[PDB]
Subunit: 218 residues, 4 copies
Amino acid sequence: GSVIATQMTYKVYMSGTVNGHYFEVEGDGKGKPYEGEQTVKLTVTKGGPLPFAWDILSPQCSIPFTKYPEDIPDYVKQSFPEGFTWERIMNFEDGAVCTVSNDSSIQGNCFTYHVKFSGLNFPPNGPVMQKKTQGWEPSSERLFARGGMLIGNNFMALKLEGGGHYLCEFKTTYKAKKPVKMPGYHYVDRKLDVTNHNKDYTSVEQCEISIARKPVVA
Amino acid sequence: GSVIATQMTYKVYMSGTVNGHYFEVEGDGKGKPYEGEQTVKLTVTKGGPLPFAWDILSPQCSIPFTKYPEDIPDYVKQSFPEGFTWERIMNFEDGAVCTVSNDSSIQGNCFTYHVKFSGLNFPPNGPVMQKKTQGWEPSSERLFARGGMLIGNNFMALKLEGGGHYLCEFKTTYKAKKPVKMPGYHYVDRKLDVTNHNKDYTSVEQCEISIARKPVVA
Amino acid sequence: GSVIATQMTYKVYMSGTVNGHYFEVEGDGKGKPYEGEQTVKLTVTKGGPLPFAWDILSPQCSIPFTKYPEDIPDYVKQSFPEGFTWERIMNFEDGAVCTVSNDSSIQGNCFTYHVKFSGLNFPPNGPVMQKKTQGWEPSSERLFARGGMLIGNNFMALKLEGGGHYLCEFKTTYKAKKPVKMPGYHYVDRKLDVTNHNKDYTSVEQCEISIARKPVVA
Amino acid sequence: GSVIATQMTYKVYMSGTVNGHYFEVEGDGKGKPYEGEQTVKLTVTKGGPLPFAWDILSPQCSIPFTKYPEDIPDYVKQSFPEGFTWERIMNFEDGAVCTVSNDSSIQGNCFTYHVKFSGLNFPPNGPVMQKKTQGWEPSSERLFARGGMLIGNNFMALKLEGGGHYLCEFKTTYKAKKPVKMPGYHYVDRKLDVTNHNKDYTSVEQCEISIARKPVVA
Ligand SMILES: [Cl-]
Ligand SMILES: [Cl-]
Ligand SMILES: [Cl-]
Ligand SMILES: [Cl-]
Ligand SMILES: [Cl-]
Ligand SMILES: [Cl-]
Ligand SMILES: [Cl-]
Ligand SMILES: [Cl-]
């Protein structure tokens, strides 16, 4: 409540590989953590232009910016100033798999995100390597507590050029760097929109709204 | 609209195996399909008492009873009177796997469900064979259209005796027996409660509420 | 050694569903269990002609007929006369999944196999429903002991019409009906050949050679 | 045949993360590529001592050193001097997942391997984070050709302290940097032994024997 301002900014430092292609990305964002609203601008600082769809990286560029009701303990925020980290597995329906690790720290009014992205087995003629994806459908992450950690499961889906979907299952484990009050079985709905970008996506702007809630039908 | 009364009844005829144990179940239910409210009474007619947790069978005992808004085409209802079928895969976090097939038909004011359940690899000392489960947490099924079919993905979870959860991923493919108007990316929230049962669950009563909706944060 | 003749015969009684299609199969086979050589004739007694590739059922039609060296304890044979059962999960690379349960008993010189097959989510335009498969490539099952059971993992592959492969991962758990001497980490190589069949595969003849061995490079 | 000496040496440059823990490793090895025999010495140059079992990294430290019969085209060797790369997915039975990318180049009598390792979701009280593993059981990789690539599937297993096994499924895709003669359905048996190491595994010596063969029972 005192550790996180109503208006925060954050920096993203991501590096990784996709089918063996190394790359680096830097971002500058801001938003209202208690409102669940945020925005960020990314810049491919190395390895660009990327030979793959930007969409697989968009969800890797900020959990603190999630609107949690008062009756539902905010796992991520509580962890600060200590901070926290998250580990993610992404299984695409065509065999591709990604493992992503994050470390979230805080310094005053700014959050710092260090991210390592590892993605491979993306079919050369698939939607990713052919850049045929058109953003993510809004999602709903199932979250529960286990071993002092918060685990989130999400059935994500990328909109395909000309109609259709490219499926991907998300599993993210959030690990606070200090004991916090564990939440109950809940969900976080999100809508991530790429609001701007250049011709080759070496520059991108993203908009995200994340709101937590109890089961709709309890 | 004319094929399905506001108040319907249905019969369930299920047979199958769990770790090689054959069994048979018969049910009698009713509800308001357009209200998404239903109830059913099950009776283990063969193989009882079952040496496993009833909870794995509860979700196998009625899609027509789902409240769909008017702006979201009801895939299942449209299929009638022709009817439809569904195929389901259940992956429990401890290795157990179940495949379930259903056939839904209609005769006047009564729906008939024929179900075949195949479940195996349930650890002998696990929550299922030890009957340590305590009902399902409310769920949220992600649904989209593909190849004239409706596919649903759900991150289900069984409440464990003494706290904790026993996870299970659901994937259900709904196949209408006739071309129908396909729906867009949506969800169906549910809460399935075992409202009554005898000492050995050879007799069970279930309550279910299923409501469809558009993404909470679009 | 006394419970199993050098020349045995067996009967197969299989029933099940594939994408909701019920069927029944009966078989009559024979072979030399200690030689790992066997043959069997199948007859679709119900639900035929099957609207799917026979190949998915061929591996479901006899572990006792496996040549085990003397330095490697034969898990399956030891279980007799008590017998044993096995549970199997089949994951095809295109999403299809099958769960199979078996019960193996013995009466004199004849083994009796009761089998329940549940398969679904086979794409309508896939190799299975389109009958474009041409038999299994020889396989190698990785076997080890756990909880008094023997678990086998196999990377199977169906030869496709015109070249190529249709992959399927096999996981089989063998459960002896009585405590037996557990084996060490080993393998069983097999070659299953459809030696004869009629136009619509309502009648089939299969040939199988199964030999156990220690790791080739220890 | 002329591009690869009968006696080669190689250098390994690996970096990565495990549950968010960054690390770096350097290796110096040698062996007889056509004999399938090789050895290598690893040194944790950064992030050591590693808080996890070394065994998960041992298989990441040399395909060129595999003995292929003459009747079976050597995919990896043919690719040189152009070289090749490989992408790997590792699924441990307790939920942990690793994605590994490699790039193999050649300069005279020395192979250079650049490796990126990403592993996460290793349970804090599991065999890996608790360093309770004792080397890999010998393995057998199922290999076949697809899309000009060679795909290998392996059912690996880590020996546990006090008996038992910690399972892990391997899937490796080999991508030659130039068109080569594709091989048929075959296998590669291996035995990887940690021949020496210091108290905290910041220094390790490994021995590997890899031999290719046709199906044992064709
Ligand atoms: Cl907890
Ligand atoms: Cl809560
Ligand atoms: Cl459609
Ligand atoms: Cl809609
Ligand atoms: Cl054992
Ligand atoms: Cl042995
Ligand atoms: Cl090819
Ligand atoms: Cl070959």
